Each structure stands twice: as C-alpha cells, then as structure tokens.
Amino acid sequence: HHHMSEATLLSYTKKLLASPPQLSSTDLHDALLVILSLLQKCDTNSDESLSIYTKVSSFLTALRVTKLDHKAEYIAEAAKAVLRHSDLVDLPLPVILDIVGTGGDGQNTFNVSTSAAIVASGIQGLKICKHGGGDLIGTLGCDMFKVNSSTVPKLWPDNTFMFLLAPFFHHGMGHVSKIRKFLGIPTVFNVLGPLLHPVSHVNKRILGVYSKELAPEYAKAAALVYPGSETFIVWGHVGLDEVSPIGKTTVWHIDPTSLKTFQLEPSMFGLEEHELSKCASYGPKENARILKEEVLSGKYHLGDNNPIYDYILMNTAVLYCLSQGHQNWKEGIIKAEESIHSGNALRSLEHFIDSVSSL
C-alpha cells in the first residue's frame, strides 16, 4: 500500500521474471530505494525481517540472472540510488584525481592503488582524494573513522593527499552488507564502489575493472555518474583491475573535450615486465611498512628493476599523464621518481596523517 513496501519490491521482481524482462534502469533505481528503506527499518528477529531478506534476495538474484546489472544505464541508476543514503561532502566553490578498482578479479597484488595515489599526491599541481575500501592507511597511526562528510572540508584546503573509507560515507552499502554476505553470489553492489565518490570536486579518475566484458559498459556508466570528468577505465589482460606489471592493459578513455581505447605495456614506461608472484601483498601492516620505510623513504630507484617499486611508478605515471592531458608515459615516470626521492610523496602522506590526528 505505501510505496516503500514488500508489495512494491515484489512488483519490481515480477518485472524481472517476465519474458523479456520489463525492469527499466529507472525501475532499478526505484527498487533499490525500496530495498534500502525496507532494510534500514528492519525489526530484528521479526517475521517481517525474514520476509524482507527473502524478497531482497529474490530481487538481487533475478537481477544477476538477467545480467541487466552489467548494463551501463542500470549500473548508473544503481549508484545514484545508493548515493541517496550517502553523506556527500559539501565544499566551498590543481587537478583533483581518484584511483580505484571494482575488485572481483581474484588477484592479491600489492596495494599499488593507495601507493600510486600517495606518490602522485607528491607531484606539484596534483591533488589526490582517493576513495576506497583500506586497512593500509589504518596501520600508519591515523583513525580513518575520524574522516567523514563533516571533517573532509576541514582536511581539504591544506592536504595534497586524502583517503576516504567508503563505509564512513555510504550508509546504503552498510544496509545491504549482511544480505550480501548471506547471498554469497556477486550482485550489482560488487561494481558500485568506484562510482560512489562523495566529493563532487574530483576532476579525473582511474577506475579499474575486473573483466574486459564489463569495461565498455563501466566506461558508459562512469560518464553518466561523473559527467565531464576525464576518466580512464583500465583492465590488465592477465585479469586485473589496474595497470598490470605483466603483459598489456586496455584503457577506455572518457574524454569530455572529444569511445577511444589504447594499449599499455611496461616497455612504454621504460620498465621491465614483472610476474604477479613478484608483486604480491604481504597484508596491510607489512604493505604499509614497505611503502613507508622502503618505497617512500627512497630505498629504490628507477632502473633497479625492483618489481613493487616499478609497479607503483607505472600506476603513478598513468595518474600524472591523465592529469596533464598527454600520453608521455616516460615523463610521468620521471615525475613519480622525483615525488619519491625529493621526499615530497612521504611529506604529502605524513601531512594527511598529522591532519587526521588533529580532528
């Protein structure tokens, strides 16, 4: 009877069981708003809670089976519906970039994403507002829970680097957290993280995706969620949501002043290829120590063929090149190298850690 009811949710699920399916991209937006209302108001241990988890499970599964949650317009409406339950950052009116992946690629490489974001943030004229999650920033002695829509505006003016932990912004993602665990299958939610940036001022971004087949739809989705933001969608050919240190990577270029694809190889950066096995994660604590006491403290050099160092330089070089409007990959390398050895990258990180500590 009320729009925000099991009855309304059921009617949207029934559009999904029709041949062909009759669920529009805007219906998916509307359905997700009903699911989030139904889940936020859940009465613990009530029959109503079981019935609701039943109908949300049913909807989300139907949506996976039809594959409409892999269509650009549907991904965008889904991100938009989720964002309605989010704390967005209100800022008073350098190039501001984000770098992040969908995940879901079944890989466990070093956190190059946060590392490149920190090294890029050391380059004069760049500002980095990375949205993610992760624990890595956690283990450098700053409470990431202190960073929310209320504190980001205080941190914003004097910081070249910032990290936003998604769960402290996206209360809608918090509401589906338990049913996602219970479902144990991928859903539309597995690909929304990168399209939920709560800072409107971000100009450019690298968005990594787990699959070649998603990339073109994810590029069209990114264009709809971040209108006029110049964007690389990246897919490493080995199956990786960032620029791979082995083999090729494809870039899908959303260029608002112009769709177009181009191919990246480590040789274009003046770097050796490295196998994924040589570029592994040692978990958050050790990743952070490696980053802070080795990479950012200048223990390694361009030309040392240190695999992790190379991997971070390359991802940094793409951030720089994206930021300046050119494909001079070796120049982004030089700029990444200078950010580290000048101490600027470590200073950018330390200033953000001190800033957070002060809240």
Q: Write out the binding residues.
A: 101, 111, 113-114, 241-242
Name which of ligand FA0, its own copies, none residue 170 binds, using a CB cut-off of 5 to 8 Å depending on partner kind: ligand FA0
Report the C-alpha gap between 204 and 230 in whole angstroms: 5
Q: Of the two residues 30 and 272, which places its CB atom closer to its own copies in the complex? A: 30
| Residue 266 is a binding residue for ligand FA0 (CB under 6 A) | no
User: Does residue 206 touch ligand FA0 according to CB under 6 A?
Assistant: no
Q: From its own copies, ligand FA0, none, which one binds at residue 258 (CB under 5 to 8 Å depending on kind)? A: none
d(CA 12, CA 10): 5
Q: How far is the CB of 81 from ligand FA0 (least distance, A)?
A: 14
Say whether residue 3 binds its own copies (CB under 8 A). Answer: no
Residue 177 binding target from ligand FA0, its own copies, none, CB below 5 to 8 Å by type: ligand FA0
Query: Per-residue string for binding with ligand FA0, 110-149, x by CB under 6 A?
Result: -----------------------x----------------
Q: Contact between 240 and ligand FA0 (CB under 6 A)?
A: no
By a kind-dependent CB cut-off of 5 to 8 A, residue 259 interacts, out of its own copies, ligand FA0, none, with none
Known binding-site residues for Mg(2+) equal 241-242
Q: Does 173 bind ligand FA0 (CB under 6 A)?
A: yes
Q: Which of residues 35-74 bind its own copies (CB under 8 A)?
A: 44-47, 49-51, 53-55, 57-58, 60-62, 64-67
Binding stretches for ligand FA0 (CB under 6 A): 133, 166-167, 170, 173, 177, 193, 196
